Symmetry: D2
Subunit: 184 residues, 4 copies
């Protein structure tokens, strides 16, 4: 018997990174309205997901609009959600002789001090890819894997010849945006 | 003592789908050249990967150039590789009451005959996303998940109320471009 | 007086990027006082919907355009699939020079030369200078990647077909507008 | 007479999309007869390299630009990182109407109106008509998604600030060129 007069969404704006999420609050007026149910909706669902409780999750770079609409009265308020780039910062996961630099959503694989170096890698349940790593020109090597998303699972190991003869590396698993690096 | 005179790559062009691969042949002249080693390289490695044996794998929509260069003489030939879109065709994986349509690289989740329907899903090792599915307006529901790639692993189940009361579905696993559907 | 329900017409439709489909909302009784609806879209990157329910395809994917009633806020949906540009081949030039349009990439080409460069600009971006890749039979190619509908490519070649080097005249390609022959 | 080796200068460099960095190849002995190199790139979608080693950033990612010697075909590499456009906010308009540039999306806005539509065209694409989304305090927003450097946006609004409806004049935004104030 106490009708909804209005709604507002707080925060009214928010920046998340990909895989990051932010809880939104629908504020229904008056305080003692009989029906305080709202429907959450988003106009760019490839940018950000919203749950039935207004938890918003960053899916991909962009700005979108999340709307709370009241069950009683169909009053609507909206917030602007900016999903930001993965920082351009370099994070080393590996050692002097071989591993990864995570550089945003590309992975730069490296082998220092070899006569050659191949990378063997797979992403999620896609197949093995074998690549010869590019020579820097000083006995060092690199190969970029491009455009991973949050939760991409990377299994890789190297083949290379540091002197004595060609050596295989132990496989490693990298999950994009969960494997901790060293922020160098 | 028999020097390389030239090289050609066959096929000279090729279309693959994403996750599809094509073996390329470097033809070194003359036939009895002492050194027949070549280096394979690709100018758009976000489009297609090439192995040290000239196996080319479709990574993402585009056209790129794969080059064989001879170890002896640095003679170069190149092929054009077109990585094609995942067909726009609709493939149903699920039943009368609930599952997926695979429509290119988007997944259309569905629940037929409910008073409401939520989807619970996760991709690779990213987190759970909870979404209320959109009403069609006849007791039916849909929710598109966007832009999966080859080997994306999707675990999902539904919550919905077909009458008696709200019911949870058994979890299912979908691997993008490996789970077989029904081409409808 | 009240409205009771609504569904949308069509319920599912497939478009190419850059193409449109007119949506129409049918609201239960004709003797419903208020007919007017609001159009919205779940996935605005994929498809845009006008205030009168015209859906245009912007990018590959499937999205949900919903009509909600002014009187009632009853809601119904169409599933819109935006299909990618065919990887058919479209030749725009002559035996010596031009593009192949292969979906959203352009394969620029020069046939019969000792080198070939490309000079191109996309819309109001900067000019880029590139050496075209040798094929190994006196011909050259260079892919420009991932053009979107309405992209405007200005370009000319520098090549030497033997009796000395040449700059061709600038041509204008508009992506999804300019046409050629496929074969 | 021969060349013995080469490395590239710089070895690693980071650019924004649309920005450039001059690469230089240093080939072992100065008393190497032939100095000339060929520039190539592993990832042409990410970065373009000119015949004289100028690398321009086209799109987010890391790629390898290699200099190989004409005499010797010795090869060396730089790792190029192309950084995304900051998600800083850039206001281009007044208290009533304009855009926020937020990385590669534009948030169009009208403040203080009873409705607001956007009319926009991108480069030589078609005009799109959209109803701007109510905020719930008499203001309106509408994101345009994923513009690339050099994209040319023509737009005007239809809104009613109370004493009746208005079409504003068309403005031209060029992505990464047009500027405003961030704050
Ligand atoms: Cl979207
Ligand atoms: Cl949006
Ligand atoms: Cl690439
Ligand atoms: Cl390429
Ligand atoms: Cl959607
Ligand atoms: Cl690369």
């Amino acid at each position: 018997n106490v009708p909804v007069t209005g709604v507002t969404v707080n925060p009214t704006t928010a920046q998340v990174e990909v895989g990051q999420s932010v809880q939104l609050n629908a504020s229904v007026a008056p305080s003692n309205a009989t029906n305080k149910q709202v429907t959450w909706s988003v106009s760019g669902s490839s940018i950000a997901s919203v749950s039935p409780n207004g938890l918003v999750t960053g899916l991909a770079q962009g700005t979108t609009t999340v709307t709370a609409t009241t069950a009683d009265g169909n009053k609507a308020a909206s917030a602007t959600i900016t999903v930001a780039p993965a920082p351009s910062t370099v994070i080393v996961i590996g050692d002097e002789v071989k591993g990864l630099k995570k550089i945003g959503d590309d992975l730069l694989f490296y082998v220092n001090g070899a006569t050659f170096a191949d990378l063997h890698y797979k992403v999620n349940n896609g197949g093995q890819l074998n690549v010869a790593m590019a020579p820097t020109g000083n006995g060092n090597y690199t190969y970029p894997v491009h455009n991973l998303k949050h939760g991409d699972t990377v299994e890789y190991f190297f083949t290379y010849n540091p002197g004595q003869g060609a050596l295989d590396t132990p496989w490693q698993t990298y999950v994009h945006g969960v494997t901790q690096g060293t922020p160098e």
